[PDB]
């Protein structure tokens with residue numbers, strides 16, 4: 076009943092913000108530009124510093140014209156509307172949002188520890204306890220999101236930041252969507268796509284549980300279970316129902332992975348009558364204190380090294396390009412609700 080009441084309150088609070096989203100809560104000239112932290116085909120993520128408080132933030136800047144051209148309008152509206160409405164210990168917080176003549180802006184908490192992707196590639200692979208610590212946080216985060224009728228749709232190491240306590244902060248909600256029932260958009264990242272996405276089916280939250288299987292495999296092995304030069308070759312492996320496990324994987328890990336990487340979505344853990352409890356009660360998680368993880372009381376396997384809230388040493392170097400704001404409004408109608 077404790078979990079039920081928790082999720083009931085979580086949904087109440089989410090829906091109130093969902094129905095009345097915040098808008099226009101800062102402006103660009105409140106911030107100093109520090110560094111480019113990431114890029115995409117229609118925007119960039121910057122480290123910025125607020126000029127009055129001195130606080131650092133990560134500012135995602137999306138070019139409205141490129142969002143229109145790449146048919147990402149709905150996805151960008153989803154992203155901001157969801158982010159401003161959610162609240163969970165392992166989700167990055169949206170602090171401000173605004174738009175101008177050219178761009179959309181989401182100003183988020185800055186996590187100086189960097190992406191799990193970098194740490195995993197540096198270390199090689201995580202031990203099972205280390206992978207399990209991160210996996211437990213994703214399980215709880217998906218329990219939360221799915222209870223709000225939200226599908227995340229982009230789980231992968233690049234989207235998981237490691238905070239000062241060594242815990243996960245999920246970011247990059249660009250494909251997240253509120254869905255009752257099924258949805259159809261082809262989106263995600265190839266190595267992490269469930270078979271039903273590849274096969275152009277109507278799909279549901281089970282795709283997130285498939286992606287968790289991919290993530291756990293990748294964390295524990297050091298490479299993803301389905302890999303190839305061309306996406307088509309990846310997709311053939313995904314739909315085949317065949318995966319090879321390293322000998323060092325425990326029996327419990329292999330068993331959990333066969334049930335998450337279940338090609339038949341009607342038999343996949345997380346999508347059965349017992350829902351998330353088939354995962355939480357699996358033997359691989361027998362040592363996990365779910366409440367202690369939620370309360371951030373478990374000592375983390377790994378604390379990223381950084382010097383302070385402005386340190387960027389865990390992020391990569393990108394060309395520093397101008398961020399121009401047109402003298403004239405672009406695509407105003409399309410982004411009215413942002």
Ligand SMILES: NC[C@@H](C(=O)N/N=C/c1ccc(O)c(Br)c1)c1cccc(Cl)c1
Nearest residue numbers: 113114115118119120133184185186246
């Ligand atoms: N990796 C690529 C990704 C990215 O860099 N996201 N970073 C988010 C972030 C949030 C909060 C933070 O505290 C930190 Br630090 C980083 C991306 C880049 C450009 C456009 C788009 Cl749509 C997505």
